[PDB]
Amino acid sequence: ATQGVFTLPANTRFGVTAFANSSGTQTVNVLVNNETAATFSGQSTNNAVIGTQVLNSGSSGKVQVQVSVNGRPSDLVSAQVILTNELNFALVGSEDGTDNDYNDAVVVINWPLG
Amino acid sequence: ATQGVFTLPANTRFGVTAFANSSGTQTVNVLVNNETAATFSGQSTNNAVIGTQVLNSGSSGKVQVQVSVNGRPSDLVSAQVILTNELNFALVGSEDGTDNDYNDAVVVINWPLG
Amino acid sequence: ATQGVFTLPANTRFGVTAFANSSGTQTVNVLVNNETAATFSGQSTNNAVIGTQVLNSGSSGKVQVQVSVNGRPSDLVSAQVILTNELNFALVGSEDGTDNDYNDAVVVINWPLG
Amino acid sequence: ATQGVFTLPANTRFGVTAFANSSGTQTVNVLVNNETAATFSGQSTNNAVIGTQVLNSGSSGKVQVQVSVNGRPSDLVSAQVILTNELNFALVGSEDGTDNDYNDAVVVINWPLG
Ligand SMILES: C[C@@H]1O[C@@H](O)[C@@H](O)[C@H](O)[C@@H]1O
Ligand SMILES: C[C@@H]1O[C@@H](O)[C@@H](O)[C@H](O)[C@@H]1O
Ligand SMILES: C[C@@H]1O[C@@H](O)[C@@H](O)[C@H](O)[C@@H]1O
Ligand SMILES: C[C@@H]1O[C@@H](O)[C@@H](O)[C@H](O)[C@@H]1O
Ligand SMILES: [Ca+2]
Ligand SMILES: [Ca+2]
Ligand SMILES: [Ca+2]
Ligand SMILES: [Ca+2]
Ligand SMILES: [Ca+2]
Ligand SMILES: [Ca+2]
Ligand SMILES: [Ca+2]
Ligand SMILES: [Ca+2]
Numbered sequence: 001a002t003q004g005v006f007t008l009p010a011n012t013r014f015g016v017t018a019f020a021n022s023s024g025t026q027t028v029n030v031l032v033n034n035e036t037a038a039t040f041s042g043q044s045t046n047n048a049v050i051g052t053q054v055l056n057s058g059s060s061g062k063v064q065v066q067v068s069v070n071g072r073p074s075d076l077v078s079a080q081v082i083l084t085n086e087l088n089f090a091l092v093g094s095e096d097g098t099d100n101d102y103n104d105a106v107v108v109i110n111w112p113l114g
Numbered sequence: 115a116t117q118g119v120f121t122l123p124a125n126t127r128f129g130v131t132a133f134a135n136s137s138g139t140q141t142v143n144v145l146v147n148n149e150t151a152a153t154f155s156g157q158s159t160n161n162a163v164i165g166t167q168v169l170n171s172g173s174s175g176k177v178q179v180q181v182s183v184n185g186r187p188s189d190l191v192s193a194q195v196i197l198t199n200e201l202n203f204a205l206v207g208s209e210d211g212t213d214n215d216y217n218d219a220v221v222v223i224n225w226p227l228g
Numbered sequence: 229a230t231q232g233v234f235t236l237p238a239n240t241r242f243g244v245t246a247f248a249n250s251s252g253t254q255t256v257n258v259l260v261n262n263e264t265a266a267t268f269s270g271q272s273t274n275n276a277v278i279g280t281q282v283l284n285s286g287s288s289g290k291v292q293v294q295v296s297v298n299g300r301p302s303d304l305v306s307a308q309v310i311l312t313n314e315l316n317f318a319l320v321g322s323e324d325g326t327d328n329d330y331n332d333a334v335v336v337i338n339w340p341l342g
Numbered sequence: 343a344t345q346g347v348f349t350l351p352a353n354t355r356f357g358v359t360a361f362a363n364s365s366g367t368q369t370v371n372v373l374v375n376n377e378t379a380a381t382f383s384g385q386s387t388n389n390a391v392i393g394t395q396v397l398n399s400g401s402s403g404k405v406q407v408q409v410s411v412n413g414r415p416s417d418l419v420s421a422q423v424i425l426t427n428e429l430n431f432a433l434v435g436s437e438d439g440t441d442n443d444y445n446d447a448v449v450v451i452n453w454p455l456g
Contacts, residue, residue: 001312001345001419001437001444015161019129021227047129047227052163077197077343079421080310084191084229087207087216093197095343101226102201102343108222112215113135113161115305115323115330115426117229191229193307196422198343209229216229243361243389249455275357275455277394305425312419315435315444321425329454330429336450340443341363341389 003076004065006090006109008057014111016065017052020044022104024069024096030107031064032057050105054113067094067105077102088112117190118179120204120223122171128225130179131166134158136218138183138210144221145178146171164219168227181219183210191216202226231304232293234318234337236285242339244293245280248272250332252297252324258335259292260285278333282341295333297324305330316340345418346407348432348451350399356453358407359394362386364446366411366438372449375402392447396455409436409447419444430454 008014018028018040025043029036032055040051057063067074074094081089090109093102122128132142132154144152146169154165171177181188188208195203204223207216236242246256246268258266260283268279285291295302302322309317318337321330350356360370360382372380374397382393399405409416416436423431432451435444 001417001435002442003312003343005313007313013160015133017131017133017163019131019224045228047127047166047168047224049131049163049166052161054161075343077201079195079197080313081193081195081203081205081423082308082310083193083205083207084214084216084231084306085233085235085308086214087191087220089203089205089222091195091197091203093201093343100198100200100343101228102198103224103226103228106201106224108131108203108224110133110161110217110220110222112217114159114215114217115231115303115328117426119427121427189229194424194427195309196424198345199347199349199422207229214230245359245361245391247357247359247452273456275355275394275396275452277359277391280389280391282388305429307423307425309421309423309431309433311421311433311435312442312444314442315419315448317423317431317433317450319423319425319431321429328426328428329456330426331452331454331456334429334452336359336431338361338389338445338448340445342387342443342445 003078004092006063008061008063010059010061012057013054013113014109015054017108018050019047019106020050021047022096026105027068028105029066033060033062065092065107069096117192118206120177122175122177124175126171127168127227128223129168130223132164133161133220134164135161136210140219141182142219143180147174147176179206179221181208231306232320234291236289236291238287238289240285240339241282241341242337243282245336246278247275247334248278249275250324254333255296256333257294261288261290293320293335295322345420346434348405350403350405352401352403354399354453355396355455356451357396359450360392361389361448362392363389364438368447369410370447371408373406375400375404407434407449411438
C-alpha cells in the first residue's frame with residue numbers, strides 16, 4: 001500500500017518536523033501538490049530534530065513525504081490520527097536498513113495551526 | 115477519561131517534543147514515574163517547537179504530560195498509535211480557551227530511538 | 229474534551245457496529261445531523277455484536293455516538309484513524325462503571341463502503 | 343513494511359471482526375502463534391459482518407490477519423490505536439483490485455474483553 005501520502009484541507013497551514021535515528025544521513029523531502037516544498041537533511045542516533053517548517057497545503061491539499069539515505073529510498077510506514085474531531089497528525093516512519101525499527105527518519109505533520 | 119498518561123516500555127529512551135499554537139504562553143511538564151523530568155515553555159501561533167528532549171521511561175514506564183497556561187491546567191486529549199507493530203507515537207493536544215482547537219500545546223512522544 | 233463526535237465527508241455512507249463487554253445492558257444511539265438515526269441495544273460480557281447498520285453521513289457529515297447504561301450516559305473515549313489515505317475508522321469506547329476498561333460498549337464506524 | 347501482524351498481551355481474550363466491501367468473496371484467516379484460529383468468508387458490498395469471534399492470544403501473543411480472494415492474497419494495510427492508555431484496536435484494511443479503497447475486507451481486533 002502507498003504510504004507517506006496525505007490529503008489535508010485545501011489552503012491550510014501545517015507543521016512538518018523530522019527526527020533522525022540512524023547511522024545514515026537522512027534526507028526528507030516534503031512535496032505539496034507533487035512539487036518539493038521543503039527538504040531536511042541530518043544525521044543523529046539520538047532523535048535530533050533535523051528540520052521543522054510551516055507549509056501551506058495549497059489548492060489540492062496533497063502532501064507527500066519521501067525519505068532517502070545517500071540516494072537510496074527508505075521504506076515508509078504512515079497513518080493519520082484525529083483527536084477530538086479537531087487535531088490532526090500525519091505520521092511517517094522510515095527504514096533505511098535491516099532492523100525494521102522504522103525510526104531512521106520520523107516525520108510528524110500536524111494541523112491546524114494558530 | 116484520563117488523558118495524557120502513557121505506559122511506555124520500561125527503561126527505554128523516548129523523544130518528547132512540544133509545539134505551541136496560542137496567544138497564551140504554554141508550559142508543558144513531562145512526568146516520568148510521577149516526577150517532573152522536563153519542562154518546556156513558549157508562545158507562538160505558528161507551531162514553534164518550544165522544546166524537544168530525550169528522556170528515559172524508567173522502571174515503571176509511566177509517562178504523563180501536563181499543560182498549563184496562565185497558571186491554569188489545560189484540558190487534554192490523547193491517544194497512542196503503533197505502526198508496523200514497532201514504531202510508537204503518543205499524541206497529546208490541549209485546550210487553554212474556548213475555541214476547542216486543542217492545538218494550543220501539542221505534544222508528541224516517540225519511541226524507540228536510535 | 230468532547231468525544232464520540234466525527235465529521236465524515238458529506239453525503240457518504242458508513243458502517244456502524246457496536247460490541248458489548250459489561251454486566252449491564254448497553255444502549256447505543258447513533259446520531260446524524262443531531263438526530264438519532266439508529267439505536268442498538270444488548271448485553272454481553274463476550275464482545276457480542278449488539279447492532280450493525282449502514283447509514284448516510286448526510287449534508288453536514290456530523291455523526292455522534294452516545295452510550296447509556298443503567299439510566300446514565302457512559303463516559304466516552306474516541307479517535308479517528310486513516311490508513312493509506314483511504315480507509316477511515318472512527319472508534320469509540322465507553323465506561324459504565326468504575327474499572328475503567330472502557331470496553332463496556334465499543335463502537336466502530338468505518339467508511340467508505342462498497 | 344510488514345502489515346497485519348500484531349503482538350497482543352499473552353493469554354488474553356480478544357475480539358476479531360471482519361467486514362466485506364467488494365464484488366469478490368473475501369476469505370479472512372486469523373492466525374494465533376502461526377496457526378489458523380478463525381476463518382470467515384463472504385461477499386458483500388454493504389459492509390456485512392462476514393464473521394466475528396472471540397479468540398485467545400495464547401502464550402505467544404502473536405496475531406496475524408491474512409486476506410485472500412479465491413487463494414489470491416490481498417494487499418494489506420494496518421495500524422494499532424490505544425485509547426485512554428487501556429483500550430486497544432488493531433485495524434486492517436485490504437485491497438483485492440485496482441481502486442485502492444482498501445475496504446474490500448476490513449478487520450478489527452479489540453481488547454480487552456469482558
Ligand atoms: C544505528 C543504526 O543505523 C542504521 O543501521 C539504522 O537502520 C538502524 O535502525 C540503527 O539506527
Ligand atoms: C490565538 C488563539 O489563542 C488562544 O485563544 C487559543 O485558545 C486559540 O486556539 C487561538 O490559538
Ligand atoms: C462485568 C463488568 O461489568 C461492568 O461492571 C463493567 O463496567 C466492567 O468493565 C465489567 O465488564
Ligand atoms: C465492487 C468493487 O469490487 C472490487 O473491484 C473491489 O476491489 C472494489 O473496491 C469495489 O468494491
Ligand atoms: Ca532502521
Ligand atoms: Ca534506527
Ligand atoms: Ca484553543
Ligand atoms: Ca490554538
Ligand atoms: Ca467498565
Ligand atoms: Ca467491561
Ligand atoms: Ca478495492
Ligand atoms: Ca471495495
